[PDB]
Every structure is written in C-alpha cells, then in structure tokens.
Write a protein that binds this DNA or RNA. Structure first.
Lengths: 56, 110, 117, 120
RNA sequence: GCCAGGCUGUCUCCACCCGAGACUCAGUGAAAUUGAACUCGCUGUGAAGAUGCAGUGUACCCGCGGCAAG
RNA sequence: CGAAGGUGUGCUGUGAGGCAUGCUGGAGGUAUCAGAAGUGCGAAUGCUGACAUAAGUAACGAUAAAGCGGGUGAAAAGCCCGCUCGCCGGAAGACCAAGGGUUCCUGUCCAACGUUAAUCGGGGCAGGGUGAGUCGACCCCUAAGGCGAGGCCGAAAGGCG
RNA sequence: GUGAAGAGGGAAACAACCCAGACCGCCAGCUAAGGUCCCAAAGUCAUGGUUAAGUGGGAAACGCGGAAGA
RNA sequence: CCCGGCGAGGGGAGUGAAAAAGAACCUGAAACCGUGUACGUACAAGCAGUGGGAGCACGCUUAGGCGUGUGACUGCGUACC
RNA sequence: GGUUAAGCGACUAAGCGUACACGGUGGAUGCCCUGGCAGUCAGAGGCGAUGAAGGACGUGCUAAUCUGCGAUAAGCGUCGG
C-alpha cells in the first residue's frame, strides 16, 4: 500500500483548502471597563459583566 | 508610502504560519491586531509581533495617521532548513528538516 | 584540456523549455518531460497540418450540402451539374458564397439544375 | 455511547480521579477560588457543592463524613464554621465558573471557579 | 499421540465495563515509494487481468472516519 | 559612455546555431585562419549538493499520576517555595571496582539540543572546587602467561628455552 | 507480400487483411480500397426481384429445433 | 533613534561607487515555495497535446477585424529508453 | 407601463491550472589565487649514542590554536648586512 505516482501540487492545494481557520469577529466591549474581550470571557484586567474580578 | 517589516529565520514552519497569515490580509490594523491577539497560535503571536513592528516603523519613520494603516501585502516563505539525524529501528537513521519561516508585512495608508 | 559544459547545457535546457509553455505544470517545468512533450506536440502539429485541410474540406462540403438542400437539390447532383456545365468554383468559395450571399447560391443552384436538366 | 450517561471521563483511573477531585475541592475551599480547566471545574462542581450542602447542618456524623471526603482537617474546620453560616440562607449555586481564555502551554480552556460571595 | 473428572467465551454468540492508541485542538516533526496525470463501470480487441484503445452507460468540485476487492 | 555570467524581446538559417538590445553584473572577453580534446547527457538498481512525495499522516520513546497558592519571568504545568495524591523502598536507597574525564557548584544567557513552551538541564560563556605515613595505587614476593642475555633449531625474519 | 526498418486511409480498437512507399509548405481538385440514414463527408437514387425471421447481426451434417462463451 | 523581551530579528540615519555588498556578506541559475495582475474552471471522463475556435483585459493601428495572456466547444491522438 | 406564462441567461472561485512583475533556502554558471599535477637546470644524495625520524608536557602582558624554542624555553652569546 504505497503511492504509485507523485501527488500533484494542485492536489496538495485542493486537499489543504479545508485547513483554513476562521476569525472570531465577535469582539465584545465591556460596558464598564470599555475594553474588548471574547464573548463570555473576561477582559485583560479581570472585568466581566461590569464586575471587578480579582484580576490576578 | 509603503512600510515593510519582516522576521527572518522564524522558529516556525512557513506552511503552518500561512494558515494564520492569510486571515489578516486585506484587513484593517485594529481588526487584524484583535484577531492575532485572540488567535492561539505560535505563528499568530509571531505575525502579531511582526505587524506591531511594522506599525511602529510606520509611526516613527513615516509621518502620521496610524489609524488609517492597512495590511497591504503579507507573505510568508520557507527559509534555511536545519538538518538533524534521528535514530530508528534496525540501526537506521532519518534526516529531519526543521523549517524556518520568513514573514513579511507591508502596510500603506494610501 | 578540460571543457565545462554548464553553459551549453543551460542554453539547451532553456531552448527546450521555451517551447513547453502551458503544459500543465511538470510537463512545462521539468526538462525531461518537456522535451518529450515538445516532441509529441510537434508530431501532433505535423499530423494536424493535413488534418486541418481534411476538416476544412469536410466542413465546406457540409455547408455546401446544407445550402443545396435548402435550395432543393442534393450536394452530389449540384456538383455534377457544375462539372457538366464546366463550373469550377472551389468548395471553400462555394461555402463562403453560400454564407455571405444568398442570391449568389440561388443562382448557383439554378445553373446547376439547368445543366442537369 | 454516552446515552443518558453522566460524568466526563477526564482520562485517568477511578482512584486517580477521586484523589484529584478531593484535592482540588480542598484547595478550592481553602483559597475561596482556583484557576483550572473548564471541564475540571465543571466536574468539581458536582462533588464540591454537596460538601457545602452537608456542611449546612452541623453534627458529629456530618463532620466525620465531611472529613472522610477530602481527607483533611483544615477544610473540615473551615466548613461548618465559615461557609456554613455564609451559605445557610442560600440553596444551591455555591460555586461559579468564569472562563478566562486559554492556556499558553496547552491552549485548552481555563476558568476561575470560586464561591459566589468570597467574603471580598 | 490418545482417553476419563472439574474448569472455563475456543465456540454456539457475542454483550457491557476499566485503561493506552484510534477522533478534534495546541506545539515539534520521518520513512517505504514516486516517467507525467484533468487517475469511473460494462462489451470487443490488445505481450495474454485495460483508470487511459473502439462502442455504450454513469458521475457537481473538494475534504474527513473505516473495508481492504484491485 | 560598460566584458563574462543570469533572465526576456526582436531578426535570421534546411541544423546543431548566430546578431541587436532592456534588466542585476563592475572586470575581463576575443574577429578570420589553423591544431589537441577530460569536446556536446535523458535514463547504466550510476555518484555528489539541494528540494517536493506520502503530509503537516504516523509518532512525540511501558497505564508509577499529578494537582493547587505564591516567587522570578513578557510568556509558568514541567524553574523555586509551601500544601495535598501516588510509585520504588534485597529498589527506582547509599558507597565503591571497571569505565566516562569536569558532565560537580556558583553568576549569567537562548545562538543550537530536550521528539513540545523553558526563564530550566547532564545546553553556551566566566569563576571555584579534588588537601593522605594510616584510603587505594606506588613498592616487595608470587600462579596462568609474556620478555628472556648465554644456548638449541631454522634459507633470513623467526620458534623454543 | 507486410512488418522487422513504411508513415497514411478502410474494417472498432488490432501487424501479418485491402489500397497506398510520407523532401517541405498552401483554409486547392481528382482518385485506389472502403462508403453515401445520423453519429461521421457523401443517394433515405432508380431499375427487376428475395426475406417476415431482426435471418442481416452465430456456426456444417437431418426433416426454423441441433446452433452453447464466462 | 524606534518596535522588539535587557533578546534574535526588523525599520530609519550615516560610512560606503554600490548596504539590489551587512559579516548566513562577488556574480546568484535550475527543481521547490507565495503574493498581486489577466483568463478558464462547481454536469464533466482518459499520455492532458495539437488544428480550428469565439469569448474574455492590454498595446499598437494616429479606426483597418494585428500581437500578447487563457482556452468554453470541437476532429485526431493508448509516454520515453 | 403593471400582472400572469414560456424560452434564453452571464455576473460567485472554498481551491486549482496557465502567462507576467516581485520575492524566500539554493550556491550552480562566470571571474581570481599565498593550492595541487607534470617536466628542465643545479646541490644533496642521508639523519643519529657528542642521543635520528616522530611525539607528550611546558615557554607571550595571554584563556585557546598554529608556528619558533626547551627551566637560558615566540629566545641567549660572538662576528657581519
């Protein structure tokens, strides 16, 4: 069970076409801190739902 | 004008790096930075650093208007490959090529 | 003395590859495949140098037959009428006239029928 | 097939999982907050909240059982004395989990799991 | 090498469960082998087992988990 | 004021070919006529250097098992501290013989290695560390065995003693 | 005689069958074998007949049955 | 001088004839790997070429149906030693 | 012009192929030699128990190497350029 002919670069590209990732494009700006974060995630300085997290 | 910033001999494969590089092609600086920050990839952080260096070069060397910048041309290619020897069964050896990626980002407000 | 053949080999490879444009990747960029590809393409061109004449003659015959059937006569009967009337219009000219001039081919068929009858 | 089955595997042995849950529950009770993988915190909830539920009522048998679980004395002492009175007026929802992105080493989900009150 | 007693999933007949691979994610990263591929089925032929010839039928393009009939 | 080399365009010959010139090249090339080839590569399971192939697939090297808070650090699950769980415990404990020869400790650091991140390490650089009358070697005697003056043998080397 | 060392056209491909020995080129005509319902270029042409079985399109011995290729 | 982690790396200024000479440092090919431009490709079957062939973008013609880039469709075509 | 009905119908490229411009490892081609191969003319045709050829260890203001040297150790004494 070994290859008989060389796979083409076209075949390589068409096989890797499905390897592309996706952008979140869903940045949420906190009401209080006014900074962006992922949906249902805290900000850099521990802020979420206008609540001051320990942020450590 | 056009400001170019590149990282040479990066500790990543060009094929894998392109997967994240293609995302920030033709997108504004703010959205590209956000996507790179919230993308969990070694290539993502590498391209984030490259784009930050490009933005800094534009701000310092060139005139003004950081906001109006854009990722005009981003491309990643393969570079020198480090050859290493890995033992296998029957006392044989395999030659493994550790790859490096040259990343380049060119921006222009125009 | 010693002679280095690098320049000659490079020139020959470039000459071979220049004629291998648009051969779907390997057959255009690989010297070995390109050379054989070039030879095969040249053989096909040599065959087509006469295949073109055959195809054009058959197309002209088909167009003349179509026009003759439109006018109400068979291609063989029309050709026989022209030959017995001493009309030696080439098939390419007949097809072009049938295409770009209807009255001309009406006259052709009229003369052919008159000669036949 | 997981057809109406509960309990994520979290690949480990049964005893290893039990010890992991006990130790993490004890640490959570001690520190009032911990930082761990989201599946780990979710699996913690089910075993940690019953601890506070039992601590709601103070008795010799309850204290002995709360010691048997988590095999610690400081955790038991803190229970029935601090968290008990604090959550006596609340039924359920003793712990809350808040996701905090991923991990640089793993990129797996991580979250802070902590008591709702936390006494500031 | 054969026979007698218990024994058992060898089997009738295979079913569930406990762990490591197998599947996705993050990072590192080979080999066997490779004339060129836009690599379908049936009939006939063909250096004698036709993906590639002549006739006919089918099939949007490209990935992912397995069988190996070639 | 622009030669070889590399890459395109045009012209030309029945042919291997020849001429003009844009581009990088900043120093050599060589008309015509004659003479010798290490004189013309597409294959010999050919050799040397580089690169796709399967593929970003396997695999990441016994199922003893990691987790939590803090310190350094830009990055902490693999570095350090403290707590909890587990394994070996006639071993997975400790020292020696043989072997290895500075890998031992400190300060500093990520160029390359750890089948991953690394600040860590048996990784790079600089410094320190080995103190013998009582340890062993060394030294005296000695089996197996070797050398072995005189001597025997053998063309010479050389064998025995 | 062909191939071996002969291209090309016709029969489905096919080398031992038929015509025909490719100096090169032209969007010219004619013809040999083979065909004139289309695929695919040409007669759905005529004249006097045969066939009722798709015989044509599978094969001899008897009076269409023997007559069968995965 | 700036981004970068006190780094590697890069962008400016300057020396330099040249930094399209930066120590991985004369000239810098082919196979391999991407970007931008122009065309084709999601109903079509086979050595992937050839003749015809519109269509699609640009320059020329001081319109002239011309060349370059691709080949929807179509007859033929079962690699080399 | 609005409605019903019938026929035709490009504009999409997740990716791929073709041609052009620019790039990445690549060190091939071209240019150069304090390097080799082969001959001619000459000396020498041997070195050493007054200790040969070859090696270990040391010698700088020196941490390592090459080269010279050997406790007088990248040198010392006499006589000349």
């Amino acid at each position: 069970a070994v290859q008989q002919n060389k796979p083409t670069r076209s075949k390589r590209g068409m096989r890797r076409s499905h390897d592309a990732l996706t952008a979140v494009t869903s940045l949420s700006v906190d009401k209080t801190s006014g900074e962006k974060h992922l949906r249902h995630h805290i900000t850099a300085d521990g802020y979420y739902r206008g609540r001051k997290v320990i942020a450590k | 004008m056009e400001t170019i910033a590149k990282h040479r001999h990066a500790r990543s494969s060009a094929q894998k790096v392109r997967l994240v590089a293609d995302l920030i092609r033709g997108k504004k600086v703010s959205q590209a930075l956000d996507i790179l920050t919230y993308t969990n990839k070694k290539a993502a952080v590498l391209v984030k650093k490259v784009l930050e260096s490009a933005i800094a070069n534009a701000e310092h060397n060139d005139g003004a208007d950081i906001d109006d910048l854009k990722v005009t041309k981003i491309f990643v290619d393969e570079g020198p490959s480090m050859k290493r020897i890995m033992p296998r069964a029957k006392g044989r050896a395999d030659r493994i090529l550790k790859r490096t990626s040259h990343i380049t980002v060119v921006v222009s407000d125009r | 003395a010693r002679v280095k053949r690098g320049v000659i080999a490079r020139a020959r490879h470039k000459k071979i590859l220049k004629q291998a444009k648009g051969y779907y990747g390997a057959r255009s960029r690989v010297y070995r495949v390109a050379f054989q590809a070039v030879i095969k393409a040249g053989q096909y061109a040599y065959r087509d140098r006469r295949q073109r004449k055959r195809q054009f003659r058959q197309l002209w015959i088909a167009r003349i037959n179509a026009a003759a059937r439109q006018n109400g006569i068979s291609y063989s009967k029309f050709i026989n009428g022209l030959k017995k009337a001493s009309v030696e219009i080439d098939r390419k000219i007949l097809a072009d006239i049938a295409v770009f001039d209807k009255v001309a081919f009406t006259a052709l068929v009229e003369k052919a029928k008159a000669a036949l009858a | 097939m997981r057809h109406r089955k509960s309990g994520r595997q979290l690949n480990r042995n049964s005893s290893h999982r039990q010890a992991m849950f006990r130790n993490m529950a004890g640490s959570l009770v001690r520190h009032e907050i911990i930082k761990t993988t989201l599946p780990k915190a979710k699996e913690l909830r089910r075993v940690v909240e019953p601890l506070i539920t039992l601590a709601k009522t103070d008795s010799v048998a309850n204290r002995r059982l709360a010691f048997a679980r988590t095999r610690d004395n400081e955790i038991v002492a803190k229970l029935f004395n601090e968290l008990g009175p604090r959550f006596a007026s609340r039924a359920g929802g003793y712990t809350r989990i808040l996701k905090c992105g991923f991990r640089a080493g793993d990129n797996a989900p991580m979250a802070y799991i902590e008591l709702v009150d936390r006494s500031e």
